[PDB]
């Protein structure tokens, strides 16, 4: 799927009842100089001893984001890997009428992570019981003069206490920035339906700035929950150096 770079990305399975997801981000160094690359593709990445894709194309493992890098001198850093983060807490409620906005206007940011959530999600009825609530929120960027939506998020669940999520985005224009997150659901007028939202904090990501000039890195970013408590042993069915062979 290309030479010098690759993306892989077998999709993640949809979750059932909220819950977090542990992520395992690795970066493995192989060989020197320009190498040919994988023998086949995503079927050449073995997570413990099993290829990601079955020999027929079926996904043995879901949630893998291999990003191959050859050994070319002019490379680019492996995207999606962080190096440092700056977390600022602004925990406030988000009402239908009022958005929030914070005007980060930093200088050395690379990606933006939003920590939103809901304080509760039960839908109580008379005589008892509870049901989901269908909360909806929207994250928008300044984009000069027009607030274009970046990430709209819908949450279904029961819960009883605070639940927090996160959303990442990039492509950030220059930085007289204005971010925004606003509410879509009307409000919790009644007492039996509590669906209050909240914007706990936001994080600034600086990512990896070192494009390792001549090694061949891989990077995986696989969810670590599917595997057991044991460590993950990544293996690669690669090809070798691009030699200087006679014409």
């Amino acid at each position: 799927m290309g030479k010098g770079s690759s993306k892989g990305h077998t999709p993640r399975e949809a979750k059932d009842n909220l819950k977090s997801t542990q992520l395992l981000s690795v970066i493995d160094a192989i060989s020197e100089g320009p190498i040919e690359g994988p023998v086949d593709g995503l079927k050449s990445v073995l997570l413990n001893s099993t290829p990601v894709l079955d020999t027929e194309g079926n996904t043995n493992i879901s949630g893998v984001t291999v990003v191959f890098r050859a050994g070319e001198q002019e490379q680019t850093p492996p995207e999606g890997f962080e190096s440092s983060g700056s977390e600022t807490v602004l925990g406030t409620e988000v009402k239908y009428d009022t958005p929030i906005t914070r005007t980060i206007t930093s200088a050395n940011i690379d990606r933006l992570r939003f920590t939103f959530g809901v304080q509760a999600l039960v839908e109580t009825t008379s005589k008892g019981d509870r049901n989901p609530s269908e909360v909806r929120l929207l994250v928008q960027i300044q984009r000069n003069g027009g607030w274009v939506t970046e990430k709209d998020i819908t949450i279904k669940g029961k819960t009883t206490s605070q639940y927090l999520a996160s959303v990442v985005m990039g492509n950030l224009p220059p930085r007289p920035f204005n971010i925004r997150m606003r509410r879509m659901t009307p409000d919790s007028t009644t007492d039996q339906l509590q669906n209050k939202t909240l914007w706990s904090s936001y994080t600034e990501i600086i990512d990896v700035k070192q494009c390792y000039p001549n090694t061949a890195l891989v990077g995986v970013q696989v969810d670590s929950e599917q595997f057991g408590s044991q460590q993950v042993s990544r293996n690669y069915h690669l090809r070798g150096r691009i030699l200087q062979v006679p014409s």
Binding site: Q22, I30, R113, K151, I153, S166, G240, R241
Partner: protein, 55 residues
């Protein structure tokens, strides 16, 4: 125990400090020298616009 190793292969993810950078010459299934390995919390939402958390 009785396993035989060679001088031209490795299926291990070895330590990568003061340990030189290997060289691969054609084909082969290889281990690696782990450069970074961190466990964090995955952030829901991959690309596009619509994100649904609970279903």
């Amino acid at each position: 125990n009785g396993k035989q190793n060679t001088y031209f292969s490795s299926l291990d993810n070895m330590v990568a400090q003061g340990n030189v950078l290997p060289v691969l010459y054609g084909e082969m299934r290889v281990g690696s020298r782990v450069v970074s390995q961190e466990i964090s919390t995955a952030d829901e939402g991959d690309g596009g616009q619509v994100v649904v958390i609970g279903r």
